[PDB]
């Protein structure tokens, strides 16, 4: 199907407890494949998927180089941010970055992304057309003038549309057996009486990949988003995901309810009846 590569980075300042903590991870779809912890001893980009382990020393040295530079740039960025906003240097702040590209079923470029956050809120982002920046406040406006003057986009765009997609294609192939599989959800239904007049029906989805899924209850065929508890999709820790949807039902009316599941692993959407 469609595929994506993402790098997520977090920098957290520790005023008085030394230099900021810096963590970065890389993903392809939902599968993590790299990591860097500025607090770890190795002090290198470390593999987190068997398939990436193939990469030669040249890979780990260049990648390490880039992510290390980033941690230093982020370190300074937190300092600058304090200046821009005139914040106290006793406070702890967070600086996040998302980078990546999407491609389609044949590995053609789809979309590119390069955006930051400060303290959990949008700071600055590259626009969809990858030619201009969106800045969220006046501070971000300073960074935007500088990046336009510097012509940073020209570089990022060519990278996203060129190096990022080649990289993704390459990763997808080397990890074909893993990355290009789609495990469908094993499903089932549970019943939990709560009162003398009420019971709960829980609709389960297990062992599916990728994470993208839709679980929806119905009553006589009528959608129902009001009376339904839905949990967030959660990893099983083995590469698959889990989720469930639940409704309370009058005792004796379990049969009017149907559960619907949608996942790319399914040739046809599923309808389950108690």
């Amino acid at each position: 199907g469609s595929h994506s590569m993402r790098y997520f980075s977090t920098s957290v300042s520790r005023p008085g407890r030394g230099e900021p903590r810096f963590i970065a991870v890389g993903y392809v779809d939902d599968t993590q494949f790299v990591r860097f912890d500025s607090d770890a001893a190795s002090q290198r980009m470390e593999p987190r998927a068997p398939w990436i382990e193939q990469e030669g020393p040249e890979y780990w040295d260049e990648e390490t180089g880039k992510v290390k530079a980033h941690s230093q740039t982020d370190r300074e960025n937190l300092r600058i941010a304090l200046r821009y906003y005139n914040q106290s240097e006793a406070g702890s702040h967070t600086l996040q970055m998302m980078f990546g590209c999407d491609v389609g079923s044949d590995g053609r470029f789809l979309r590119g992304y390069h955006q930051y956050a400060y303290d959990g809120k949008d700071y600055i982002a590259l626009k969809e057309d990858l030619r201009s920046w969106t800045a969220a406040d006046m501070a971000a406006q300073i960074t935007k003038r500088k990046w336009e003057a510097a012509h940073v986009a020209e570089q990022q765009r060519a990278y996203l549309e060129g190096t990022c997609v080649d990289g993704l294609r390459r990763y997808l192939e080397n990890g074909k057996e893993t990355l290009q599989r789609t495990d469908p959800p094993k499903t089932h239904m549970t019943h939990h009486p709560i009162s003398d007049h009420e019971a709960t029906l829980r609709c389960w989805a297990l062992g599916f990949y990728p994470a993208e899924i839709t679980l929806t209850w119905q009553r006589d065929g009528e959608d129902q988003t009001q009376d339904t508890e839905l949990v967030e999709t959660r990893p099983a820790g083995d590469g698959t995901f889990q989720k469930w949807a639940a409704v309370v039902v009058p005792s004796g009316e379990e049969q009017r309810y149907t559960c619907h599941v949608q996942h790319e692993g399914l040739p046809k959407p599923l309808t389950l009846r108690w």
Binding site: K66, V67, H70, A81, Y84, M97, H114, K146, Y159
Partner: peptide, 8 residues
Amino acid sequence: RYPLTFGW
């Protein structure tokens, strides 16, 4: 392929 980053 980890990106290049720039100063704020």
